[PDB]
Amino acid sequence: SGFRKMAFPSGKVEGCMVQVTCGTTTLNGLWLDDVVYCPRHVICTSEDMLNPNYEDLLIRKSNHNFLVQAGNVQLRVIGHSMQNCVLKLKVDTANPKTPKYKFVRIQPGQTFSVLACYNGSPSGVYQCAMRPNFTIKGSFLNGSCGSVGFNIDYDCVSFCYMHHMELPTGVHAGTDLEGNFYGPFVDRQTAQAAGTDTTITVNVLAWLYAAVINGDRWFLNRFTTTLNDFNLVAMKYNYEPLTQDHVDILGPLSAQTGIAVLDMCASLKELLQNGMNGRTILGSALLEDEFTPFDVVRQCSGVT
Amino acid sequence: SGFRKMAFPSGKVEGCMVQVTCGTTTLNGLWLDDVVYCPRHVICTSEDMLNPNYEDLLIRKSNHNFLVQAGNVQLRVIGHSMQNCVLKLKVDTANPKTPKYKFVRIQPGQTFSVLACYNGSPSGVYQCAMRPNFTIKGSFLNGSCGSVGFNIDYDCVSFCYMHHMELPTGVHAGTDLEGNFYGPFVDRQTAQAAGTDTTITVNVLAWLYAAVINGDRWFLNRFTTTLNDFNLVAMKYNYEPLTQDHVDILGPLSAQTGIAVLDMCASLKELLQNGMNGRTILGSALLEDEFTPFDVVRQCSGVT
Ligand SMILES: *CC(=O)N1CCN(CC#C)CC1
Numbered sequence: 001s002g003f004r005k006m007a008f009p010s011g012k013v014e015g016c017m018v019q020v021t022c023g024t025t026t027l028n029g030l031w032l033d034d035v036v037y038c039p040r041h042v043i044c045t046s047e048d049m050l051n052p053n054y055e056d057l058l059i060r061k062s063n064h065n066f067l068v069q070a071g072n073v074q075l076r077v078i079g080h081s082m083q084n085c086v087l088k089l090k091v092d093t094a095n096p097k098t099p100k101y102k103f104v105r106i107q108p109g110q111t112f113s114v115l116a117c118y119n120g121s122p123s124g125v126y127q128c129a130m131r132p133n134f135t136i137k138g139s140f141l142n143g144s145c146g147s148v149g150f151n152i153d154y155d156c157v158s159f160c161y162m163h164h165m166e167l168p169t170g171v172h173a174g175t176d177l178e179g180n181f182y183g184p185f186v187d188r189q190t191a192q193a194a195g196t197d198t199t200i201t202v203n204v205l206a207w208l209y210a211a212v213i214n215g216d217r218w219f220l221n222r223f224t225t226t227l228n229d230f231n232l233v234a235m236k237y238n239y240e241p242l243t244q245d246h247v248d249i250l251g252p253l254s255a256q257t258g259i260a261v262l263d264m265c266a267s268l269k270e271l272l273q274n275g276m277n278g279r280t281i282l283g284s285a286l287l288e289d290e291f292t293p294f295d296v297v298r299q300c301s302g303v304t
Numbered sequence: 305s306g307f308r309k310m311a312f313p314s315g316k317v318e319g320c321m322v323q324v325t326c327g328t329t330t331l332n333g334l335w336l337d338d339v340v341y342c343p344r345h346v347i348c349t350s351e352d353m354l355n356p357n358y359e360d361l362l363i364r365k366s367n368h369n370f371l372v373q374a375g376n377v378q379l380r381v382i383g384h385s386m387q388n389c390v391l392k393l394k395v396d397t398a399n400p401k402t403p404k405y406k407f408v409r410i411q412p413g414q415t416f417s418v419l420a421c422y423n424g425s426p427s428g429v430y431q432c433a434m435r436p437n438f439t440i441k442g443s444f445l446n447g448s449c450g451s452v453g454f455n456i457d458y459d460c461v462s463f464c465y466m467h468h469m470e471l472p473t474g475v476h477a478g479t480d481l482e483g484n485f486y487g488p489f490v491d492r493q494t495a496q497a498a499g500t501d502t503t504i505t506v507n508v509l510a511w512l513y514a515a516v517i518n519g520d521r522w523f524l525n526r527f528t529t530t531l532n533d534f535n536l537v538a539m540k541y542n543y544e545p546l547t548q549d550h551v552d553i554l555g556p557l558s559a560q561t562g563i564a565v566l567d568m569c570a571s572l573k574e575l576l577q578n579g580m581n582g583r584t585i586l587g588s589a590l591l592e593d594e595f596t597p598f599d600v601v602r603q604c605s606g607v608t
């Protein structure tokens with residue numbers, strides 16, 4: 001028993017991290033097969049970031065300008081291309097440590113592990129959620145760009161995120177592995193509005209089920225609600241509206257615990273209206289939304 | 305910027321995990337050089353755990369009874385010995401993936417990463433603290449025993465913990481890599497009192513410094529305190545008494561932020577007496593004690 005914000009084992013991704021330098025800018029890259037993927041702003045100076053013309057900046061660069069180092073050995077660059085906001089540097093050597101992988105574009109509310117890196121070296125790993133407004137609340141310093149987000153299903157790594165920037169508000173923005181930003185963000189040092197964020201309702205209910213499974217039950221009440229009634233409360237507290245698709249995904253947790261999804265919604269409703277009254281749930285004093293129903297099932301069943 | 309409960313990259317430890325089976329019991333082992341380390345209760349049946357005589361149970365076992373599998377390949381056991389609560393199975397092959405390592409016994413209040421494993425396979429990684437009462441609040445199901453806790457300094461892995469059991473209260477107990485339990489715990493299925501736990505005061509202040517560095521400053525006040533005055537409040541709220549050694553370890557954070565340690569203590573004092581008033585600090589609604597001053601410095605400087 002016990003419930004933790006658990007990240008995927010980072011080994012398979014550590015073996016893919018490389019350092020990419022272009023001019024005086026050093027970022028992280030992801031080496032899979034004979035391609036190194038990195039944020040295209042590796043070609044910018046700090047001055048260029050204010051209003052970069054990536055096409056014009058990249059034309060001044062040749063294969064030999066991209067210095068790619070994997071640990072202590074240098075990779076030879078034989079091609080470069082820009083795809084959206086990522087650069088793909090073709091190297092002459094396939095990464096011997098390339099795991100089975102896929103590039104996937106995750107949905108808002110889905111979770112993933114981030115391997116924070118600097119100079120191609122891993123510093124740490126943490127679990128986070130893609131916010132409904134397509135930002136992530138990470139831990140990233142200058143040099144972390146190119147660090148990636150991923151999920152793992154047995155032996156296959158699904159890369160979903162590449163870090164590109166910190167908004168002036170301190171939250172983080174990035175792309176899928178095809179270089180498409182999540183959200184309305186552009187790789188430019190300008191003020192950028194992130195949407196109004198909301199709480200991931202389905203994740204909070206999944207976490208409430210994890211709490212019941214692991215012994216924390218004080219919040220269970222004698223009430224029930226309807227999807228319509230619950231959603232009026234969800235709107236007032238800036239929670240995402242719950243749909244039948246969300247109820248269906250909670251089905252296994254509802255079946256395991258014997259607590260109907262709408263009864264769990266009534267518990268959530270009372271917690272939103274009354275607060276925790278100084279109590280905690282799974283060591284937290286707020287309603288946690290960074291665990292999907294799939295995460296709760298996996299952690300509660302010990303999936304390796 | 306941003307601050308997360310970050311674990312060490314688990315790659316170096318993943319390469320050491322093996323499955324150990326003895327009779328009908330399967331646990332995880334740690335393969336370093338030509339030795340596999342695992343909890344000695346791998347020799348017990350569920351019945352034996354009530355009151356095991358490990359010496360007598362181990363005498364009925366030969367090298368061929370310990371089935372050690374690393375991924376898909378079987379290791380040949382050529383020796384077995386019990387050291388405190390761990391078994392050391394000498395194998396005929398040195399682990400090719402053995403990182404630079406040390407066995408260290410950590411102090412209460414210190415933090416470490418746990419690589420939760422089942423059947424020798426890694427499921428996830430999370431950061432936790434050794435409680436002042438020598439328990440850990442982990443996430444461990446049956447089969448997770450033998451999973452290990454560790455810290456990493458550049459290329460050296462310092463193994464500090466091996467998981468052995470869940471107390472009836474749902475908290476976790478284990479040993480150092482020499483098989484010595486942290487705390488008064490015994491590897492027996494009996495009711496065992498964990499001491500009164502306390503909050504790791506030095507870690508809370510370190511986290512308050514991390515909050516100031518990362519922008520959360522609402523809790524800073526116009527007050528100061530003394531070590532004596534602060535400790536009277538710490539005693540009332542079951543916080544560990546702050547010593548000059550703790551103040552000294554906070555020195556770098558106090559120097560970086562310009563906030564004297566006793567002024568941060570006065571902020572902590574007001575937070576203990578008044579609560580958060582519905583506000584949050586670094587996305588938390590309670591005072592976090594799972595970040596040491598060293599963790600805050602490392603995460604805030606991007607140590608790889
Ligand atoms: C994204 C990142 O890590 N940064 C470091 C380099 N800065 C200047 C350039 C290019 C941008 C932020």
Ligand SMILES: *CC(=O)N1CCN(CC#C)CC1
Pocket residue numbers: 329331345346348349350353445446447448449468469
């Ligand atoms: C420690 C662990 O993972 N357990 C699974 C096996 N149980 C019976 C035995 C031996 C003990 C708990």
